[PDB]
Design a protein around this ligand. Structure first.
Ligand SMILES: C[C@]12CC[C@H]3[C@@H](CCC4=CC(=O)CC[C@@]43C)[C@@H]1CC[C@@H]2O
Lengths: 247, 13
């Protein structure tokens, strides 16, 4: 199982947000900690992506692009998984030092978004998603959002995405075709469900960046740049998710 | 051109 071996081997470890849990909750402290967590996880997503089979055959500008567009979805999906495995989706396990209960979901001013993320987490339970299905699905999320005008070398991206879909299908293949078919259907629907969540978070973080000075929310270096240059391309429709099913 | 991100992509470390 060469492909699964690799994904297992390269999977990032635990990342802490640096949140002070000894202090009372506030919108500013929670969001500043989430922002710092995003920066920390981005460092890990880059190291991971570089190690994915075939990633480096992409044009370097395209490597940059897929990372810059896909991080929100990737990170939401991984957080959904952590939440499922660590706390049976009861709370949102952003990091060991940043676990959102309902009060934090309210104080963060992201309650509705948190609801959807917890629903995603529950799906891993409801669908009985395996660790190996999770790994293949997460890898595929890196290749699920691109410019409508295409990438620099679209053909190499298309080939890579194709191969990650095939690896997912293999990990699903059940000597009964109907079982594998229903399963692939379910998992592709679940992958699609990440995108509207990521989009709502894109809008929220962009709006927050625009007003960050007014609410005492800190955005680290890479996050601020990505959210001001790359995220607006998503929000303006220049960059769109790749859906399996018609929305 | 995100310099910090490109640096992370370019560095081996
Ligand atoms: C983008 C954001 C900071 C980074 C957060 C994001 C919510 C989803 C998320 C889950 C993680 O596990 C890493 C941090 C991220 C990626 C937050 C929504 C608003 C805040 O500005």
């Amino acid at each position: 199982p060469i492909f699964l071996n690799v994904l297992e081997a390269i999977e990032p470890g635990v990342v802490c947000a640096g949140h002070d849990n000894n202090q009372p909750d506030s919108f500013a402290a929670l969001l500043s900690s989430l922002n710092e967590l995003g920066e920390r996880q981005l460092v890990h997503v880059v190291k991971w992506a570089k190690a994915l089979p075939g990633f480096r055959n992409l044009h370097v500008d395209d490597q940059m692009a897929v990372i810059q567009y896909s991080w929100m979805g990737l990170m939401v999906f991984a957080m959904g998984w952590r939440s499922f495995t660590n706390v049976n989706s009861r709370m949102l396990y952003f990091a060991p030092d940043l676990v959102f209960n309902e009060y934090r979901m309210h104080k963060s001013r992201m309650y509705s978004q948190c609801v959807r993320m917890r629903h995603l987490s529950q799906e891993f339970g409801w669908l009985q998603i395996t660790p190996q299905e999770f790994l293949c699905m997460k890898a595929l999320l890196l290749f699920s959002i691109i410019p409508v005008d295409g990438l620099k070398n679209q053909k190499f991206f298309d080939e890579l995405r194709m191969n990650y879909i095939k690896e997912l299908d293999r990990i699903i293949a059940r000597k009964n075709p109907t079982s594998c078919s229903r399963r692939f259907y379910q998992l592709t629907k679940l992958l699609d469900s990440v995108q509207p969540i990521a989009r709502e978070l894109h809008q929220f973080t962009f709006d927050l960046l625009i007003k960050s000075h007014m609410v005492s929310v800190d955005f680290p270096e890479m996050m601020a740049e990505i959210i001001s240059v790359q995220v607006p391309k998503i929000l303006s429709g220049k960059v769109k998710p790749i859906y399996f099913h018609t929305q | 051109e995100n310099a910090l991100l490109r640096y992370l992509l370019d560095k081996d470390d």
